[PDB]
Design a protein around this nucleic acid. Structure first.
Lengths: 180, 201, 146, 185, 103
RNA sequence: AAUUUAAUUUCAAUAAAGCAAUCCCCUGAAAUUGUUUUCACUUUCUCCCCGCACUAAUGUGGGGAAAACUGGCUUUAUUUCU
RNA sequence: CAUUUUUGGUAAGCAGAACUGGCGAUGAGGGAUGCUCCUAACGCUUGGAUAAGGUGCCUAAAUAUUCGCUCAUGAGAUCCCA
């Protein structure tokens, strides 16, 4: 529906297996959940992991399932812990981060934004190894601990912007910053 | 626009945006009187701006400064130069736009009688954070020796005090107009009076 | 123990800060698909973003927006933090906040403007005609006063 | 980063405050002191009845925390100054030549003669509201007093800066007038 | 007073330029009220009249007219492309135009 | 501006019932190959105790209770109140 | 001449090779400008919608939205490219 705050990164549960052979009379079936912008991207990342772990390329296997995975309670805000492997210019690093968000997909988008903004790391150079809902008391980030207080009621303190129609070129008098 | 003369009170406005908005209007078609032009804001610091003006002064010519550039010292002329930069002034179309612009430091009284407009996106408050350094264009000009400042300071104060006397008189007049209007609202025929009230009187 | 005349003192403080991001405060959306609608502050996602939830009158679903897209109103209704749509409807109906908004000067300017926007051609003439009657009478009163 | 940072600033009993829109003014026995803080964008609020001031910042960063701690210290100095003037006791050191300290202009300008036997005059005028007296008790001692710790210190610094040698060794030659003791009346 | 105008005001901008390139088939029109594509879309099919003053008597008169019609936007701020029955002169850039209420 | 019948772990009210209280839709933390079992977690503009105004606050720091309004489940009907 | 592989030579907008594509023999749009980079090869016209590429102004489209990071008493800002 939305296109004003929207994230098109979604989560897909993907299942595949090795093709039956004389050597592989009974295959091994493999499942994983993967965050991607589309089904082809999800599949290609799944295939890359099948290649990295197993000996199975797209040629050597067959896809059992790919399906988008559904938010249980979208109105509820939840504490996500996310564990990364990422590449810098001069090396590879592991990192564990906390985000309070409605859903895991919002968190992954936030994570890519954070890694890009603060570390210059592109989506290609990041690998999420597990994102999951965790207890509020177990968060290490002060900015999320501050939200988790009993009484939250800060003053808003931001600029007006309106929209294109009432985005006047010139004005008779000077604007009111406080807004009250 | 669609009006004979825009007058702009350029106090508290940020240089680049103020110039750009003026320029596109000149190109669109409009005579524009830029007024109160020492109280324009540059986003750099005083030292940083002094350095930039120093580089501008350093730029001259080896050959013959009679064919050199102009190091205009008026804050109004600084705005004018910036607008000129934002016009294709070596054309005829650009020259016509350039001619349409009028610049003045302080409030010239024939155009103080006129209404003043502002450009709301271009204020220092509007596009700069509070905790980041800035510098007033007149302050910078004074630093690099323009020094026509005290006369304007006296003139602006005298004009402002008269404007206060004008504002109180205007308030008196408006209050009296409100009082007669409210009294003579009773005398209107009921249905018509109800309609006028409905649509916001 | 409790306040007596110290009650006046706390009351008569001149503190600038008001319109806190409290749960159940009314806010006017200024941008996006649901612009010009009024809505309550439910949750706070993060420093930029909040969970807003429309009035049943205004027709805006429960959803995340940036706080920057709201113009906060004075009124606020105190509610428990976990509440959903039935309780929000029951509370809004109870507290009659839209009437308070209509009474409020910004609300009043908006509703007057709304009438003026929707006014028909005959209605427009009637406003002109009424103002003309008023000016005639008002000028006659100005003659009267001296 | 943080949403909320606060400070609760105790005020002495006699202080007559007037601090609106971050233009802080404190009056007391020794004077009225005015000091803008309008570059610092924070919610200091007064409480007259139960005394104290509450300072609060919205959406703090460590820069903001530095500002809050700085302002509260600065405000406390303003209270301290009006209640009791800040006195900088400056001892005049010389290992050879008598250095003549003649206070002129009603405790406003100290005349200094004969630094390193120079046979010449250095006059060093004070800032507004900072009195320069001499000590009856200790011959080398000079009292620099006023309502503001910054102006008295600056006045003292000006006196040091005025005296100091161009080019005879800093380790060897120790002569000049220095700030010994920072007190109040 | 004596006249009633019965059009809305506009400003004949340039032709439908792009950086350092010219298309003279389409003209760019600023309509006084508009500042959005969506609002401009209301006025999209309307007949447009450029009236201009001249030196000599032509058909006994010193006023002449070019006709065109608005037809599609040129931006999100509602600046609109108009196609005319013959190209309007660059001399008339920044001049006024009449946007009729019909069809 | 919409629209059709499908498809895909999708609701939300409506007003009468029930059910459990750190309990539950949930989510934690624990003892080849499947289980399964433990205790951890809600609210409050309710009440109490200490600190009595000690707070960012039309309150508050710490310590305890209370309830099921709030949320959650099981129902029974109801969908242009939403 | 370019990418990639490449030999000599301290290196070289240097000399010498390989594969392929260009230019030469080529307009057009971008790369601020530019024989070669990128987009793309061309009768005459009308209209559309896009590419490369853009959208503060010069200069056509956003002082768009959205999250980070960033103040520099010579900051930084589109391959070749200084």
């Amino acid at each position: 529906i939305d296109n004003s705050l929207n994230t098109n990164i979604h989560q897909y549960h993907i299942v595949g297996r090795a093709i039956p052979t004389a050597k592989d009379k009974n295959p091994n079936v493999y499942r994983m959940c993967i965050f991607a912008k589309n089904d082809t991207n999800a599949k290609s990342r799944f295939w890359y992991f099948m290649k990295k772990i197993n000996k199975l390329k797209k040629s050597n296997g067959e896809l059992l399932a790919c399906e988008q995975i559904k938010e249980r309670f979208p109105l509820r805000v939840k504490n996500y812990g996310v564990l990364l492997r990422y590449d810098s210019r001069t090396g590879t690093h592991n990192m564990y981060k906390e985000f309070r968000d409605t859903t895991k997909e919002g968190a992954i988008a936030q994570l890519y934004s954070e890694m890009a903004g603060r570390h210059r790391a592109r989506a290609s150079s990041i690998n999420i190894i597990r994102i999951s809902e965790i207890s509020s008391s177990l968060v290490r980030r002060p900015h999320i601990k501050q939200l988790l207080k009993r009484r939250l009621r800060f003053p808003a303190l931001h600029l007006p912007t309106l929209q294109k129609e009432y985005r006047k070129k010139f004005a008779s008098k000077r604007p009111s910053t406080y807004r009250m | 626009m669609y009006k004979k003369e825009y007058v702009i009170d350029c106090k508290g406005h940020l240089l680049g945006r103020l110039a750009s908005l003026i320029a596109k209007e000149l190109l669109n078609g409009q005579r524009i009187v830029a007024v109160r032009c020492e109280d324009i804001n540059i986003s750099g610091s005083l030292y940083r701006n002094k350095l930039k003006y120093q580089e501008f002064l350093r730029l001259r010519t080896n050959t013959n400064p009679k064919k050199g550039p102009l190091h205009l010292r008026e804050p109004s002329k600084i705005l004018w130069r910036c607008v000129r930069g934002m016009l294709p002034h070596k054309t005829y179309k650009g020259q016509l736009a350039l001619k349409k612009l009028k610049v003045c430091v302080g409030m010239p009284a024939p155009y103080d009688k006129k209404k003043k407009y502002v450009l709301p996106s271009a204020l220092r408050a509007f596009r700069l954070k509070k905790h980041r350094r800035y510098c007033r264009l007149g302050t910078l000009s004074s630093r690099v020796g323009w020094n026509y400042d005290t006369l304007v300071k006296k003139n602006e104060v005298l004009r402002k005090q008269v404007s206060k006397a004008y504002y109180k008189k205007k308030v008196n007049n408006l209050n009296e107009k409100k009082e007669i209007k409210t009294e003579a609202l009773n005398l209107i025929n009921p249905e018509q009076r109800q309609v006028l009230e409905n649509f916001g009187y | 123990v409790e306040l007596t005349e110290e009650e006046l003192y706390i009351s008569k403080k001149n503190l600038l800060f008001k319109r806190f991001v409290e749960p159940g405060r009314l806010c006017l959306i200024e941008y996006g698909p649901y612009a010009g609608k009024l809505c309550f502050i439910v949750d706070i996602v993060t420093i930029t973003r909040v969970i807003v939830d429309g009035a049943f009158i205004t027709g805006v679903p429960r959803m995340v927006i940036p706080l920057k897209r709201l113009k906060l109103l004075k009124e606020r209704i105190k509610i428990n933090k976990n509440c959903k749509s039935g309780f929000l409807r029951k509370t809004v109906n109870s507290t009659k906040v839209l009437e308070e908004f209509n009474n409020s000067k910004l609300g009043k300017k908006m509703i007057i403007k709304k009438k003026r926007d929707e006014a028909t051609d005959f209605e427009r003439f009637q406003v002109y005609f009424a103002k003309r009657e008023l000016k005639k009478k008002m000028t006659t009163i100005k003659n009267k006063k001296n | 980063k943080t949403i909320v940072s606060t400070q609760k600033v105790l005020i002495p009993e006699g202080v007559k405050v007037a601090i609106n829109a971050r233009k802080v003014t404190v009056s007391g026995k020794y004077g009225t002191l005015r000091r803008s803080f309008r570059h610092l964008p924070i919610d200091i609020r007064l409480n007259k009845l139960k005394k104290y001031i509450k300072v609060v910042m919205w959406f703090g960063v460590p820069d903001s925390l530095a500002c809050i701690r700085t302002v509260c210290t600065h405000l406390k100095n303003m209270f301290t100054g009006v209640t009791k003037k800040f006195l900088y006791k400056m001892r005049l050191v010389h290992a050879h030549f008598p250095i003549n300290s003649n206070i002129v202009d009603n405790n406003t300008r100290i005349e200094i003669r004969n630094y390193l036997g120079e046979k010449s005059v250095r006059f060093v005028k004070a800032l507004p509201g900072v009195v320069i007296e001499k000590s009856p008790n200790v011959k080398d001692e000079i009292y620099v007093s006023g309502a503001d710790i910054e102006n008295v210190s600056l006045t003292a610094a000006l006196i040091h800066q005025s005296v100091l040698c161009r080019n005879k060794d800093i380790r060897k030659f120790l002569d000049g007038i220095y700030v010994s003791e920072v007190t109040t009346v | 007073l004596q006249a009633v105008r019965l059009y809305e005001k506009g400003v004949i901008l340039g032709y439908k330029r792009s950086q350092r390139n010219q298309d003279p088939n389409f003209t760019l029109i600023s309509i006084k009220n508009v500042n959005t594509k969506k609002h401009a879309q209301f006025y999209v099919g309307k007949r447009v009249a450029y009236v201009y003053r001249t030196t000599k008597h032509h058909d006994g008169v010193k006023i002449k007219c070019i006709w065109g019609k608005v037809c599609r936007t040129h931006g999100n701020s509602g600046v609109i492309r108009a196609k005319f029955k013959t190209h309007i002169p660059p001399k008339a850039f920044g001049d006024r135009v009449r946007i009729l209420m019909y069809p």
